[PDB]
């Protein structure tokens, strides 16, 4: 998901030229029997148009 810094979602207030957003994701790993949490030190986020910006 991604949203404003506050509770309001993107749909209710579409983004201006500059302000504060956040971004979150979640992972899971299967060892044969159950799904367990997967812990990895590095993952990365990219905000690109045609050329990475962030």
């Amino acid at each position: 998901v991604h949203s404003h810094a506050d509770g309001t979602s993107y749909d209710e207030e579409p983004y201006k030229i500059k302000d504060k957003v956040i971004y979150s994701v979640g992972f899971s790993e299967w060892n044969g029997e159950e799904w367990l949490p997967h812990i990895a030190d590095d993952i990365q986020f990219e905000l690109r148009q045609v050329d990475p910006y962030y």
Binding site: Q44, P52, Y53
Partner: protein, 57 residues
């Protein structure tokens, strides 16, 4: 081709420069002098001589 890649950031632009407020108070004071000079100069001479007052119906 499959290692880690270095994190980067963005570089904004500087805002336009505002002027310090202890000058603008002086100039709005000067304007407030000049307008009262205008009203005093109208009431001094023969210009604002209220003599055709339209009383009646």
């Amino acid at each position: 081709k499959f290692g880690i890649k270095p994190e980067i950031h963005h570089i904004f632009h500087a805002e336009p420069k505002r002027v310090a407020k202890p000058i603008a108070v002086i100039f709005v004071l000067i304007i407030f002098i000049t307008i009262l000079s205008l009203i005093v100069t109208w009431l001094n001479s023969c210009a604002a001589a209220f003599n055709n007052i339209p009383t009646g119906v």
